[PDB]
């Protein structure tokens, strides 16, 4: 495994930084020089891995095409910054997050092997063709048919005309998918010659403290859309509403950076309110976990053996909700409606059902069997001379 | 000649980065080492040139004296960062944007030639004295006579006591003016022993996303407020109002960065609306161009041979509007008061008038004759050993 | 002596940057390699010193426990950035601001001497034991059961379990305190085997634009709150009211970047108003200085021999106000309550009282005797190899 040059590229967004931290640390511990290109705003997390931070300015922070336009601008701006950074310091292999595909373009120009690191499930080969009509239902908007023209023009300018705008990005050379197969929708339609389901990349055990039950709390709940974004005030009060007059339960509600006030000047020991909680520490001793369905929270709930109440909002979240529902460990709620009775029902049932608990035990064993960081590091070292 | 070290210094502001991009790229293509010092927020544009990014922290983002205070802070902060970056890596020549005159101070301290790169027209040798009372009649405010004292003190602190606060900044040793002489007010008062009118610095067209005329469109119009920030929602509706019931014409409206909200239900088939358009690509098929009168849009409208309807607001835009009006290729409107009937009239006259078209052909010919990037690069290379 | 590598670490806040600029410049002027690790937002001040800027991303930008969490995150984020930057370029000594104690953790791992640079007075080792109940009465909030415990866990990760979370931070090996002893509360309870009172670190008589006196002003006054930020417009009206009635005085009022919205008339010829003035330059010709009591402003008024009217607002300013009042060179006012009559008396009396002028002359003499930048640089060079 001759020490070689490994270049990791990602973006500052939280869901694209944490999933691969322990994988990068393992590559450093094996004697390789690892450079990590990301925005300096996440220099703390990058440097803690032990990798060389290679700073670049990220352009990432309403319309559907507008969201695609911002992502294209970041790719256009990202590529020259990596080229200047690595021109005289070329790596043996390029690792890149799903949103850092400009790194693949650089690898193709220099004849260097590249590996995609997917922080969540990938799009199946039948899923691409199924979404092809929406592409033509985007070219009649004069905005969607200028975005793709700009995208194809950028690929031609960047020295890779013989590849599709879909193939580049969503059809990598080789890819490491950091979710287990049972959290990947339509996994049988995913070609495992190309994609490898690794599962999460973990490392011994995290620190930042502990969190034990308040005495006389029989069942513990964590409600946190805390992967990143929260803002739904009416639903939060319903959570305190449900757990009010419900003793033996302890609600640990995380309302998030955007709120801190709004509470009720007192509040029983039944409800404790934070803007941030050590989610792993609370999840280790919790009996139910309410979440938005982000892959990071679900995999953390899975690893801790805690059933989940999923309230999907964005695009990755509904599919995640169906998966854990199909695994018999979760219920799906609709943030638009939901009642305290329906909320309390999903909460009280999930914590009592012993069949749910046995399924978490099995999924916990299936989770590790996917290989984790040790399997991923061996597969990356395979690409080194 | 022989490969040397060329140091370019500019600021992140939009009008001070784009005008010289192709000039720096041309200097790199000639085998020179070109370092480009700018704020990391524009690292994408700097690196794409092929130049070595040399980061420094910019202090650039109320009142007139308040505006003068921030610009002085940036000059005070810029000089030590350039000194530290170039202390042991001194270049053969210093190139600096008009707002990066601290680079000239470094060149004077180190006996290095310096060249000012002006992205628009410079201040004439007599236009200053008409404002000289206002400058001296502002030294009556204890704000104008402490700011200059701060400016004068900084010159003494920086090792250049033998120069006026006006001379350094507004009287460079050598300067490259990136506009044609016919876009420079009072050109006869510009000493061309010192300033050289280069015109815009171009280098082929990078496509950036093509835009073909819609089939069955007689003449195409582009509405985009020229060079920097926009906010005019009511004028946007009048544009859609005018081009509604104006068939055979195709309106390409750019609503711009911010405040995009406030669409209009269906939008007629005549009007297609974007937040950003490839302005060079659209101007290639345009027959009239509505703009704010920024030098960037005007020079881009000139190069494409497209008559312009100019709606100046602040800064350079009123003077720029008179220039293109004096050239017989543009009409000036007041966005607050223009009426829908007058808008279609100014538009329909400009696109139909063949005398306007002939003047544009001549102005296109005059534009190239100023030399462009090839002349600018040749003049810069003369300052190399 | 022999040129070595000195690494300074600080934070972007203004009161943690200016106090040590001239000290770093002196260490550079003495032929040493000085690296200065700070956030790039403050790169201008770092580079002007002449030191090598070592950039790291700072997480520093109501509730007692909430403030403690944000400071811990920045310390947690700072340490790996410092380790990566200095791992193969290790310094002979680590200099660190009070808020950059992760540099001390780095120095302990590498067996390197470290020196704390305190920009203001330190906490005597009796106030902490007095603060032990507040520590005990803060662990009862279920926020009180996650934060410090996270801090203790962080020490174990960083390789320093054999040190307390309080002792590390507030009990350095060696410390340079950049205030004189008469501006340090409970100075006798401060162990000077560990802490050294240096006084401010100065360097020549600067410009900042300079400021000549207007003719026909008998005595000049400068009004500028704390050492940076304010938001209280109403107090400003009383200042011009008091002076626009003393035609013999010349007021130089600093309203601050965070206002400008709202003035009064065209302004009398007695009053000149800015959002920012060269405070050192105005102090050259001033006869009274109104301030909130920030340590930066107080030491500048003290060094200029200018009596002060102190209007404390946030933390440290009342204790600083208490100090300068006890020294017989200042009067204390409450911006919320003070009236024009009490304000005008404090201004004219302080400027007229010759006993105050004599006390200022003596304190300025006491100021220099603490050693300043030359003493501090000599003490740092002692930790360097011969």
Residue numbers in the entry:
A (entry chain D), B (entry chain A): 2 to 62, 72 to 395
C (entry chain B): 2 to 62, 72 to 396
What does the paper say about this structure?
The glycosyltransferase Kcn28, which is unique among all CCNP BGCs, was expected to transfer a glycosyl group onto either the terminal COOH (5 and 6) or OH group (9 and 10). The monomeric Kcn28 contains two Rossmann-like β/α/β domains. The N-terminal domain from residues 6–208 is a substrate binding domain consisting of seven parallel β-strands that are flanked by seven α-helices, while the C-terminal domain comprising residues 229–392 is a UDP-sugar binding domain with six parallel β-strands surrounded by seven α-helices. A glycosyltransferase with relatively broad substrate specificity transfers sugars to the newly generated OH/COOH group.
We further attempted to understand the structural basis of the Kcn28-catalyzed enzymatic reaction. Crystal structures of Kcn28 as a free enzyme and in a binary complex (with 9) were obtained at 2.50 and 2.24 Å resolution, respectively. Superposition of free and complexed structures revealed a global conformational change.
